[PDB]
Amino acid sequence: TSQVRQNYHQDSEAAINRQINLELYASYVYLSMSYYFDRDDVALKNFAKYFLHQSHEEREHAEKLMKLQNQRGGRIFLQDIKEPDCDDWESGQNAMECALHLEKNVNQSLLELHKLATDKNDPHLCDFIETHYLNEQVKAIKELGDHVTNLRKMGAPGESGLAEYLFDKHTLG
Amino acid sequence: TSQVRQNYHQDSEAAINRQINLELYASYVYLSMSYYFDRDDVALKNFAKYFLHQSHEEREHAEKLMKLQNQRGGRIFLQDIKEPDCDDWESGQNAMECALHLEKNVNQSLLELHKLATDKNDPHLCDFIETHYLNEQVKAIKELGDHVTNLRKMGAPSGLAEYLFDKHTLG
Amino acid sequence: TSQVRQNYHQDSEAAINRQINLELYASYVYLSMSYYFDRDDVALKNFAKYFLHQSHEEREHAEKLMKLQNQRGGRIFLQDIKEPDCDDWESGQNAMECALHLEKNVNQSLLELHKLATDKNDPHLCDFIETHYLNEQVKAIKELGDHVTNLRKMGAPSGLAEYLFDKHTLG
Amino acid sequence: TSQVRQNYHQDSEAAINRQINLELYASYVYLSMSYYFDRDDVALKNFAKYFLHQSHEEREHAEKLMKLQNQRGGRIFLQDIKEPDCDDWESGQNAMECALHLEKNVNQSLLELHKLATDKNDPHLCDFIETHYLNEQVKAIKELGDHVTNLRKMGAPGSGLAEYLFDKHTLG
Ligand SMILES: [Cl-]
Ligand SMILES: [Cl-]
Ligand SMILES: [Fe+3]
Ligand SMILES: [Fe+3]
Ligand SMILES: [Fe+3]
Ligand SMILES: [Fe+3]
Ligand SMILES: [Fe+3]
């Protein structure tokens, strides 16, 4: 037992390690999407910047969980970061929709983590999750929904060939 | 009677209280419209900001009338602020047209208030209305007509029209 | 159902809409009090400013809840904003006591909202309430209690208490 | 007949001259009140400076009316400035009530002026009065009402602290 460990359940420690893996996977997914849009046959430079920014943000999320693990006296256990679902994301609107699904998945995992934390009467963990992750997920999900809605209304794939270009310039640029 | 009251008719006092309520109602309508555009399935950020700004401006018009009522020694009476007609404004052009309708309604109320003030030989009230409200209304109504016209000509409910208008006119 | 909605109970959506109406009501009450102290037969300018500031804060609270409603994927439904209980608030201490009662009623509404969010295992909502509302309410309630206590001790309805408190505390 | 005169009724010209005299009279009244509060047995410095400022503003209102008379082609006719109704203004509250009565009388004269201007179809004069005088009067009157209300609620002579505290904390 660590000299700092107090009121920290083995289940919470394990769940935190799982969340670390999931944030790493999300970073990887966003990296994949970013360089999809860097392809010369896709060439949407602001989509690529947007997703690269998201990837680095997810990496930070994971590092903050690793820090938390150590603060509470748990022990980090790392697993394979699995390859993203695909290498071709097929359009700006589809990439946005995939990111929305990903972030809702991460949110669900964090909500189950919070529920585990309350069931184990770990207020520090409940507040850590509320303070640093829950509103971030809500804000991210809302932003992705707004982006999907706009691409949809614009006719993005294919209805209007200007849609992805204009959205890249005026929303993501 | 108030120690400040001079040449201020009870009909004018009553009309000023009605106008106060109308300005507060306009503020409420604009707040409703603004957050309609903040929905994730509408997502037009500059429409939402535009209408929020108009909402705060309407609140300011109401408070200027409350100050005026007190300045002349009338007494403020507040009524319920009615909920707006819709919670769904359906489109950027529809909301712009509803705003134009609302602004012409407010203007007609202000013109009737000026006609009342004229009948009561209240030049201070006439000039209050002229100075602070009449050209404000004319400018608002011209701006809204301009907006409606551009959204019309752009083909707005072309799927790009609301997007582009939000970016380049309101943004 | 909204594309963004997740772990957001229908009951919580309805409670947030009721809270929006209550915050707007508080804004209306504070506006009414503020311009009570603006009339020439009351004439306490800093009481007026204080209550006007509170009115604008309450409007901000309402708008933040509408933003929240949209963020979570619910739909804003607006209703009449009821006229305040009085148009004449009769004294500075009485207005401060009415404001205390109002803030306590808002706080009780927020506490019931938090309990509902706890029952529905919505930790995002619980922290929204804890972050933006609960301690602001405790601070507002203590500040109002402070004001009431000083006005009570100064002998407020001594003819000087209201004037002195208006200058030396609310100035 | 002035080379600049246009749409300017003789009646309006006469009424402008009467207004000039009234504004100068108001200035004189305020001067009187100011130095009442400067005497050693009254000794309220901020009452004194408030009413002095009021006097100087009244003189400005008079001079602007003289400018208008000349702008429109009228001829200024000046008359005795009457001595004020009182040498002793009795108290801070009483002086503010007298100031309130004075401004309400000037306001009534201005409203009668605007009515005459309306009747003679003189929109330039109507707007001169609206722009420079009507809301000035409304604001002055509301201010004096506020002051009277506070003094009387403080138990001012119409508590021996009320005049002192009002002089320090409101007129300071
Ligand atoms: Cl002529
Ligand atoms: Cl003091
Ligand atoms: Fe994350
Ligand atoms: Fe918390
Ligand atoms: Fe308005
Ligand atoms: Fe509030
Ligand atoms: Fe004058």
XYZ file of C-alpha atoms and ligand atoms in Angstrom:
694
model
C 0.000 0.000 0.000
C 1.250 3.452 -0.961
C 2.028 5.858 1.862
C -0.339 8.430 0.277
C -3.305 6.130 -0.436
C -6.498 7.094 1.385
C -10.138 6.298 0.526
C -9.099 5.099 -2.946
C -10.768 1.862 -4.008
C -9.026 -0.770 -6.144
C -11.970 -0.561 -8.554
C -11.525 3.202 -9.016
C -7.801 2.740 -9.659
C -8.544 0.118 -12.320
C -11.249 2.269 -13.916
C -8.846 5.223 -14.045
C -6.328 3.070 -15.904
C -9.089 2.099 -18.365
C -9.978 5.775 -18.821
C -6.311 6.506 -19.482
C -6.303 3.976 -22.299
C -9.539 5.431 -23.713
C -8.205 9.017 -23.750
C -5.103 7.747 -25.558
C -7.302 5.984 -28.106
C -9.270 9.199 -28.652
C -6.012 11.089 -29.214
C -5.054 8.463 -31.804
C -8.446 8.660 -33.573
C -8.167 12.437 -33.860
C -4.592 12.155 -35.158
C -5.843 9.777 -37.857
C -8.663 12.102 -38.896
C -6.367 15.132 -38.941
C -3.954 13.640 -41.389
C -6.826 12.280 -43.457
C -7.680 15.904 -44.202
C -4.003 16.658 -44.952
C -4.147 14.280 -47.954
C -3.650 15.961 -51.310
C -6.921 14.481 -52.548
C -8.805 15.874 -49.530
C -6.882 19.065 -48.791
C -9.007 20.720 -46.094
C -6.268 22.380 -44.055
C -8.470 23.777 -41.273
C -10.228 20.439 -40.706
C -6.763 18.953 -40.289
C -5.703 21.656 -37.820
C -8.962 21.215 -35.894
C -8.548 17.470 -35.452
C -4.823 17.754 -34.646
C -5.714 20.227 -31.896
C -8.305 17.738 -30.610
C -5.683 14.977 -30.630
C -3.277 16.969 -28.490
C -6.152 17.895 -26.177
C -6.967 14.212 -25.660
C -3.320 13.425 -24.920
C -3.443 16.100 -22.201
C -6.621 14.510 -20.807
C -4.768 11.207 -20.497
C -1.700 12.723 -18.847
C -3.921 14.446 -16.271
C -5.490 11.077 -15.424
C -2.024 9.508 -15.061
C -1.169 12.337 -12.698
C -4.353 11.670 -10.728
C -3.526 7.979 -10.444
C -0.200 8.887 -8.877
C -1.673 11.557 -6.595
C -4.036 9.000 -5.071
C -1.340 6.334 -4.705
C -2.629 4.019 -7.410
C -0.356 2.388 -9.956
C -0.558 3.133 -13.665
C -1.008 0.146 -15.965
C -0.769 0.809 -19.709
C -2.240 -1.264 -22.529
C -2.015 -1.262 -26.303
C -3.527 1.834 -27.883
C -5.650 0.197 -30.574
C -5.648 1.428 -34.166
C -8.574 3.743 -35.027
C -11.649 2.266 -36.687
C -10.441 3.261 -40.165
C -7.838 5.289 -42.064
C -10.340 6.867 -44.510
C -12.999 9.107 -42.938
C -14.630 9.893 -46.292
C -15.833 13.491 -45.709
C -15.799 16.422 -43.328
C -19.323 15.743 -42.117
C -18.597 12.051 -41.567
C -15.431 12.914 -39.627
C -17.400 15.353 -37.449
C -20.044 12.650 -36.838
C -17.376 10.119 -35.899
C -15.859 12.633 -33.471
C -19.295 13.233 -31.936
C -19.758 9.479 -31.439
C -16.252 9.210 -29.963
C -16.827 12.041 -27.495
C -20.193 10.646 -26.420
C -18.430 7.327 -25.812
C -15.765 9.027 -23.700
C -18.503 10.896 -21.839
C -20.327 7.645 -21.105
C -17.133 6.119 -19.741
C -16.573 9.193 -17.517
C -20.190 9.055 -16.290
C -19.715 5.408 -15.319
C -16.457 6.391 -13.614
C -18.299 9.078 -11.665
C -20.987 6.547 -10.703
C -18.318 4.128 -9.495
C -16.752 6.999 -7.535
C -20.044 7.846 -5.817
C -20.820 4.171 -5.103
C -17.422 3.928 -3.400
C -17.912 7.239 -1.536
C -14.879 8.907 -3.133
C -15.809 12.631 -3.163
C -12.367 13.765 -4.286
C -12.648 11.613 -7.405
C -16.235 12.723 -8.064
C -15.138 16.339 -7.944
C -11.975 15.726 -10.006
C -14.148 14.268 -12.755
C -16.753 17.043 -12.492
C -14.153 19.806 -12.426
C -11.868 18.636 -15.220
C -13.834 16.376 -17.561
C -17.639 16.523 -17.469
C -18.260 20.044 -18.727
C -15.401 19.621 -21.193
C -17.265 16.655 -22.674
C -20.567 18.558 -22.704
C -18.953 21.537 -24.447
C -17.130 19.323 -26.955
C -20.294 17.351 -27.753
C -22.303 20.534 -28.270
C -19.626 22.029 -30.550
C -19.484 18.851 -32.648
C -23.261 18.874 -32.921
C -23.246 22.490 -34.097
C -20.593 21.622 -36.724
C -22.535 18.564 -37.927
C -25.733 20.601 -38.118
C -24.069 23.304 -40.212
C -22.396 20.852 -42.591
C -25.735 19.061 -42.991
C -27.719 22.221 -43.739
C -25.021 23.375 -46.184
C -25.479 20.149 -48.177
C -22.043 18.704 -47.413
C -21.318 15.100 -48.437
C -22.803 15.388 -51.980
C -25.176 18.308 -52.568
C -23.039 21.467 -52.742
C -19.354 21.220 -53.600
C -18.750 24.531 -51.803
C -19.968 23.292 -48.414
C -16.781 21.711 -47.067
C -14.575 24.475 -48.475
C -16.686 27.280 -47.018
C -17.022 25.551 -43.632
C -13.276 24.928 -43.555
C -12.564 28.616 -44.229
C -15.220 30.389 -42.159
C -15.882 28.085 -39.203
C -12.643 26.169 -38.684
C -10.353 28.880 -40.090
C -49.769 64.456 -6.334
C -45.977 64.275 -6.765
C -44.094 67.447 -5.838
C -42.407 67.272 -9.282
C -45.475 66.691 -11.475
C -46.082 69.450 -14.029
C -48.169 69.294 -17.229
C -48.144 65.455 -17.089
C -51.526 63.956 -17.862
C -52.798 60.798 -16.215
C -53.522 59.382 -19.706
C -49.861 59.913 -20.595
C -48.715 58.252 -17.360
C -50.934 55.260 -18.178
C -49.648 55.079 -21.757
C -46.046 55.171 -20.513
C -46.736 52.167 -18.250
C -48.226 50.294 -21.219
C -45.173 51.181 -23.314
C -42.901 49.899 -20.530
C -44.629 46.534 -20.677
C -44.361 46.449 -24.474
C -40.600 47.119 -24.394
C -40.137 44.334 -21.834
C -42.182 42.008 -24.046
C -39.976 42.878 -27.039
C -36.914 42.056 -24.938
C -38.447 38.688 -24.083
C -39.266 37.928 -27.720
C -35.677 38.681 -28.689
C -34.290 36.497 -25.876
C -36.458 33.648 -27.145
C -35.246 34.100 -30.712
C -31.598 34.347 -29.685
C -31.536 31.076 -27.840
C -33.471 29.416 -30.647
C -30.407 30.074 -32.773
C -28.191 28.594 -30.028
C -29.836 25.147 -30.383
C -27.503 22.398 -31.614
C -29.901 21.672 -34.492
C -29.932 25.330 -35.642
C -26.429 26.449 -34.645
C -26.218 29.960 -36.106
C -24.005 31.732 -33.576
C -24.210 35.264 -34.989
C -27.983 35.142 -35.366
C -28.076 34.194 -31.683
C -25.704 37.034 -30.740
C -27.624 39.547 -32.880
C -30.943 38.770 -31.212
C -29.431 38.694 -27.715
C -28.046 42.184 -28.349
C -31.471 43.382 -29.472
C -32.952 41.842 -26.302
C -30.620 43.792 -24.020
C -31.324 46.927 -26.047
C -35.089 46.472 -25.505
C -34.491 46.086 -21.762
C -32.650 49.423 -21.911
C -35.606 51.075 -23.708
C -37.911 49.826 -20.938
C -35.673 51.181 -18.175
C -35.411 54.575 -19.918
C -39.212 54.736 -19.837
C -39.233 53.790 -16.147
C -36.788 56.609 -15.459
C -38.982 58.994 -17.482
C -42.120 57.999 -15.581
C -40.319 58.883 -12.346
C -38.810 62.084 -13.794
C -42.304 63.446 -14.477
C -43.693 62.188 -11.133
C -45.869 59.419 -12.567
C -45.999 56.038 -10.854
C -44.771 52.826 -12.447
C -47.209 49.913 -12.567
C -45.835 46.620 -13.845
C -47.887 43.868 -15.485
C -47.077 40.303 -16.498
C -44.559 40.000 -19.317
C -46.302 37.752 -21.828
C -44.438 34.767 -23.205
C -43.477 35.172 -26.889
C -45.696 33.795 -29.637
C -43.359 30.909 -30.541
C -40.535 28.921 -29.072
C -39.646 27.753 -32.623
C -38.855 30.558 -35.080
C -38.087 27.975 -37.799
C -35.455 29.885 -39.796
C -33.224 32.937 -39.912
C -35.434 34.761 -42.388
C -38.594 33.902 -40.435
C -37.052 35.297 -37.243
C -35.884 38.415 -39.091
C -39.437 38.947 -40.401
C -40.901 38.384 -36.920
C -38.450 40.993 -35.585
C -39.533 43.403 -38.337
C -43.196 42.825 -37.445
C -42.404 43.343 -33.751
C -40.483 46.552 -34.402
C -43.304 48.006 -36.489
C -45.716 47.104 -33.683
C -43.539 48.915 -31.129
C -43.218 51.859 -33.492
C -46.995 52.102 -33.952
C -47.375 52.114 -30.173
C -44.789 54.902 -29.924
C -46.543 56.952 -32.607
C -49.835 56.612 -30.734
C -48.011 57.701 -27.582
C -46.691 60.772 -29.428
C -50.192 61.553 -30.692
C -51.469 61.315 -27.110
C -48.664 63.571 -25.834
C -49.451 66.089 -28.576
C -53.130 66.123 -27.658
C -52.182 66.793 -24.034
C -49.768 69.605 -25.060
C -46.838 67.807 -23.412
C -43.891 68.989 -25.550
C -41.338 67.462 -23.213
C -42.907 64.032 -23.714
C -43.165 64.562 -27.481
C -39.461 65.363 -27.618
C -38.539 62.473 -25.325
C -40.284 60.186 -27.800
C -38.704 61.897 -30.843
C -35.186 62.055 -29.415
C -34.905 58.570 -27.961
C -37.405 56.317 -29.765
C -38.690 57.396 -33.211
C -35.459 57.373 -35.223
C -34.282 54.340 -33.268
C -37.388 52.570 -34.567
C -36.920 53.814 -38.138
C -33.296 52.616 -38.168
C -34.186 49.237 -36.644
C -36.953 48.717 -39.201
C -34.718 49.657 -42.123
C -31.974 47.337 -40.843
C -34.408 44.443 -40.490
C -35.862 45.013 -43.953
C -32.335 45.019 -45.416
C -31.669 41.725 -43.618
C -34.926 40.126 -44.806
C -34.186 41.257 -48.369
C -30.723 39.712 -48.440
C -31.935 36.417 -46.984
C -34.773 36.384 -49.540
C -32.478 37.035 -52.500
C -29.953 34.505 -51.198
C -32.661 31.833 -51.329
C -32.803 31.132 -47.581
C -35.638 29.034 -46.033
C -29.813 27.358 -51.182
C -28.453 25.577 -48.124
C -25.566 28.062 -47.903
C -27.641 31.219 -47.419
C -28.129 31.162 -43.637
C -24.521 30.050 -43.111
C -23.056 32.820 -45.240
C -25.364 35.542 -43.917
C -24.471 34.526 -40.355
C -20.750 34.786 -41.172
C -20.602 37.872 -43.373
C -23.491 40.095 -42.289
C -24.067 39.263 -38.623
C -20.543 38.062 -37.783
C -34.224 13.366 -29.546
C -31.277 15.744 -29.874
C -27.990 14.466 -31.319
C -26.117 15.850 -28.279
C -28.429 14.600 -25.539
C -26.887 12.147 -23.097
C -27.844 11.229 -19.520
C -30.261 14.188 -19.427
C -33.575 13.314 -17.818
C -36.859 14.785 -19.058
C -37.626 15.857 -15.476
C -34.338 17.770 -15.281
C -35.129 19.546 -18.563
C -38.516 20.601 -17.180
C -36.977 21.762 -13.893
C -34.393 23.843 -15.743
C -37.202 25.504 -17.687
C -39.018 26.324 -14.419
C -35.739 27.692 -12.996
C -35.321 29.938 -16.028
C -38.752 31.397 -15.357
C -37.915 31.893 -11.661
C -34.626 33.697 -12.397
C -36.422 36.005 -14.825
C -39.045 36.634 -12.150
C -36.282 37.612 -9.720
C -34.889 39.981 -12.344
C -38.336 41.578 -12.652
C -38.744 41.930 -8.855
C -35.354 43.614 -8.484
C -36.111 45.949 -11.391
C -39.359 46.970 -9.673
C -37.608 47.639 -6.351
C -34.836 49.588 -8.051
C -37.171 52.082 -9.632
C -39.138 52.354 -6.405
C -36.066 53.933 -4.902
C -35.761 56.175 -8.005
C -38.966 58.066 -7.355
C -38.790 61.617 -6.041
C -40.620 60.790 -2.799
C -38.141 58.004 -1.948
C -34.975 59.277 -3.598
C -32.322 56.806 -2.408
C -30.081 56.622 -5.464
C -27.739 53.869 -4.230
C -30.582 51.613 -3.125
C -31.764 52.055 -6.708
C -28.368 51.207 -8.210
C -27.963 48.186 -5.922
C -31.302 46.679 -6.930
C -30.735 47.442 -10.635
C -27.412 45.592 -10.462
C -29.163 42.635 -8.835
C -31.819 42.703 -11.581
C -29.148 42.475 -14.292
C -27.378 39.652 -12.433
C -30.642 37.676 -12.253
C -31.101 38.119 -15.991
C -27.581 36.745 -16.471
C -28.492 33.720 -14.307
C -31.523 33.066 -16.502
C -29.467 33.297 -19.699
C -26.841 30.909 -18.331
C -29.552 28.364 -17.619
C -30.879 28.738 -21.191
C -27.356 28.144 -22.504
C -27.208 25.050 -20.267
C -30.572 23.783 -21.526
C -29.281 24.002 -25.097
C -25.874 22.491 -24.249
C -27.556 19.407 -22.830
C -29.966 18.977 -25.752
C -33.215 19.996 -24.067
C -35.651 22.576 -25.397
C -36.356 25.932 -23.806
C -40.016 26.562 -23.070
C -40.757 30.080 -21.883
C -43.770 31.246 -19.921
C -45.214 34.497 -18.618
C -42.941 36.425 -16.262
C -45.339 37.264 -13.427
C -45.663 40.814 -12.168
C -43.881 41.348 -8.829
C -45.855 41.176 -5.591
C -45.717 44.946 -4.931
C -45.235 48.103 -6.916
C -44.537 50.066 -3.698
C -41.847 48.446 -1.536
C -42.371 50.970 1.298
C -38.829 51.209 2.778
C -35.174 50.292 2.376
C -35.182 47.691 5.128
C -38.452 46.184 3.852
C -37.048 45.972 0.323
C -33.940 44.268 1.664
C -36.086 41.772 3.612
C -38.162 41.073 0.504
C -34.947 40.509 -1.462
C -33.737 38.139 1.266
C -37.010 36.171 1.035
C -36.720 36.119 -2.774
C -33.136 34.834 -2.770
C -34.041 32.181 -0.201
C -36.894 31.057 -2.478
C -34.493 30.905 -5.451
C -32.028 28.954 -3.289
C -34.693 26.447 -2.272
C -35.618 25.998 -5.940
C -31.939 25.385 -6.783
C -31.529 22.914 -3.916
C -34.539 20.915 -5.077
C -33.028 21.033 -8.575
C -29.759 19.587 -7.249
C -31.633 16.854 -5.384
C -33.445 15.946 -8.616
C -30.136 15.884 -10.521
C -28.677 13.635 -7.787
C -31.665 11.281 -7.981
C -31.262 11.082 -11.764
C -27.484 10.529 -11.462
C -26.662 13.587 -13.584
C -23.303 14.621 -12.109
C -22.798 17.244 -14.836
C -25.960 19.044 -13.722
C -25.029 18.714 -10.033
C -21.710 20.388 -10.714
C -23.320 23.048 -12.895
C -25.541 23.975 -9.962
C -22.681 23.723 -7.445
C -20.410 25.882 -9.613
C -22.612 28.706 -10.792
C -25.482 28.946 -8.321
C -25.225 27.492 -4.802
C -22.457 29.615 -3.302
C -23.621 32.729 -5.138
C -26.938 32.180 -3.340
C -25.231 31.701 0.052
C -23.261 34.925 -0.529
C -26.372 36.854 -1.617
C -28.292 35.591 1.402
C -25.534 36.534 3.845
C -25.119 39.961 2.210
C -28.850 40.655 2.457
C -28.867 39.484 6.071
C -26.006 41.883 6.762
C -27.905 44.770 5.196
C -31.094 43.967 7.105
C -29.209 43.739 10.389
C -27.524 47.105 9.930
C -30.753 48.818 8.871
C -32.536 47.259 11.863
C -29.846 48.416 14.295
C -29.715 51.968 12.847
C -33.456 52.282 13.596
C -34.539 52.221 9.946
C -38.281 52.122 9.099
C -34.077 57.406 13.199
C -34.692 59.584 10.143
C -31.010 59.362 9.168
C -30.608 55.587 8.892
C -31.779 55.146 5.300
C -29.728 58.132 4.043
C -26.582 57.041 5.890
C -26.848 53.391 4.871
C -27.452 54.499 1.273
C -24.311 56.659 1.287
C -21.896 54.679 3.470
C -22.726 51.051 2.540
C -24.413 51.041 -0.880
C -22.418 53.973 -2.265
C -37.175 94.344 -40.139
C -34.038 92.199 -39.916
C -32.465 90.873 -43.105
C -32.353 87.453 -41.422
C -35.934 87.429 -40.097
C -38.049 84.560 -41.371
C -41.141 82.931 -39.801
C -40.504 84.728 -36.500
C -43.634 86.166 -34.959
C -43.585 89.470 -33.079
C -45.337 87.684 -30.205
C -42.546 85.085 -30.025
C -39.960 87.890 -30.012
C -41.696 89.550 -27.048
C -42.050 86.245 -25.219
C -38.329 85.518 -25.702
C -37.502 88.886 -24.114
C -39.753 88.051 -21.138
C -38.043 84.670 -20.793
C -34.639 86.368 -20.793
C -35.752 88.509 -17.878
C -37.134 85.460 -16.048
C -33.888 83.493 -16.432
C -31.837 86.447 -15.165
C -34.239 86.748 -12.246
C -33.754 83.057 -11.457
C -29.985 83.638 -11.539
C -30.421 86.490 -9.040
C -32.530 84.300 -6.731
C -29.904 81.576 -6.753
C -27.163 84.135 -6.067
C -29.153 85.316 -3.026
C -29.654 81.779 -1.709
C -25.959 80.977 -2.224
C -24.665 83.765 -0.072
C -27.316 83.096 2.537
C -25.629 79.764 3.144
C -22.214 81.510 3.228
C -22.967 83.599 6.304
C -21.222 82.633 9.530
C -24.490 81.860 11.359
C -25.538 79.371 8.652
C -22.198 78.066 7.464
C -23.141 75.331 4.951
C -20.408 75.558 2.313
C -21.864 73.037 -0.118
C -25.353 74.490 -0.078
C -23.648 77.772 -0.939
C -21.680 76.346 -3.841
C -24.655 74.329 -5.142
C -26.808 77.435 -5.402
C -23.939 79.501 -6.847
C -23.516 76.914 -9.608
C -27.283 77.126 -10.151
C -27.064 80.916 -10.535
C -24.287 80.689 -13.106
C -26.285 78.117 -15.094
C -29.330 80.427 -15.093
C -27.192 83.259 -16.471
C -26.100 80.901 -19.243
C -29.750 80.096 -20.051
C -30.422 83.825 -20.343
C -27.418 84.431 -22.593
C -28.447 81.560 -24.897
C -31.910 83.093 -25.234
C -30.285 86.440 -26.139
C -28.233 84.649 -28.785
C -31.442 83.089 -30.133
C -33.188 86.457 -30.252
C -30.333 87.802 -32.389
C -30.178 84.613 -34.523
C -33.847 84.976 -35.478
C -33.719 88.739 -36.153
C -35.539 89.888 -33.025
C -34.432 92.821 -30.917
C -33.494 92.294 -27.283
C -35.333 94.566 -24.850
C -34.028 94.336 -21.298
C -35.808 95.336 -18.110
C -35.164 95.594 -14.379
C -34.065 92.346 -12.782
C -36.340 92.164 -9.746
C -34.844 91.674 -6.301
C -35.529 88.165 -4.944
C -38.586 87.541 -2.786
C -36.472 86.853 0.319
C -33.185 87.929 1.833
C -33.364 85.123 4.416
C -34.066 81.639 3.044
C -34.554 80.078 6.511
C -32.909 76.631 6.092
C -31.582 74.132 3.586
C -34.923 72.424 3.057
C -36.782 75.708 2.664
C -34.264 76.975 0.129
C -34.591 73.781 -1.871
C -38.398 74.079 -1.800
C -38.089 77.686 -2.997
C -35.711 76.514 -5.755
C -38.277 73.853 -6.692
C -41.029 76.489 -6.911
C -38.745 78.723 -8.987
C -37.871 76.032 -11.511
C -41.513 74.963 -11.811
C -42.406 78.587 -12.612
C -39.650 78.818 -15.235
C -40.832 75.501 -16.666
C -44.396 76.808 -16.916
C -43.165 79.911 -18.727
C -41.195 77.680 -21.114
C -44.226 75.474 -21.766
C -46.326 78.553 -22.505
C -43.521 79.707 -24.826
C -43.574 76.377 -26.676
C -47.363 76.557 -26.957
C -47.070 80.010 -28.541
C -44.337 78.714 -30.888
C -46.578 75.794 -31.863
C -49.500 78.168 -32.458
C -47.364 80.436 -34.663
C -46.051 77.462 -36.659
C -42.423 78.056 -35.619
C -40.799 74.599 -35.543
C -37.312 76.075 -35.152
C -38.341 77.765 -31.888
C -40.180 74.647 -30.700
C -37.015 72.633 -31.228
C -34.795 75.267 -29.577
C -37.033 75.000 -26.514
C -37.151 71.185 -26.632
C -33.415 70.777 -27.176
C -32.032 73.251 -24.656
C -34.736 73.890 -22.015
C -37.508 71.290 -21.554
C -35.537 68.275 -20.319
C -33.233 70.666 -18.453
C -36.246 71.786 -16.445
C -37.536 68.236 -15.917
C -34.121 67.155 -14.601
C -33.670 70.208 -12.371
C -37.115 69.707 -10.882
C -36.572 66.006 -10.241
C -33.228 66.784 -8.597
C -34.746 69.401 -6.300
C -37.614 67.060 -5.427
C -35.093 64.344 -4.501
C -33.208 66.844 -2.324
C -36.358 68.063 -0.548
C -37.472 64.470 0.061
C -34.158 63.512 1.654
C -33.969 66.624 3.867
C -37.506 66.212 5.190
C -37.056 62.469 5.737
C -33.867 63.269 7.682
C -35.983 65.538 9.908
C -34.359 68.715 8.563
C -35.596 72.111 9.836
C -38.456 73.200 7.590
C -32.437 66.399 13.983
C -29.708 69.044 14.064
C -27.414 66.751 12.070
C -29.579 66.572 8.950
C -28.467 69.784 7.228
C -24.803 69.129 8.087
C -24.848 65.527 6.825
C -26.796 66.394 3.688
C -24.343 69.215 2.995
C -21.402 66.840 3.365
C -22.676 63.660 1.717
C -25.044 64.813 -1.015
C -24.008 68.343 -2.047
C -20.292 67.719 -1.426
Cl -40.942 86.858 -39.653
Cl -21.684 60.254 8.238
Fe -10.833 13.334 -23.505
Fe -18.601 19.442 -7.106
Fe -37.865 49.319 -28.156
Fe -30.478 34.194 -9.530
Fe -33.164 78.521 -16.499
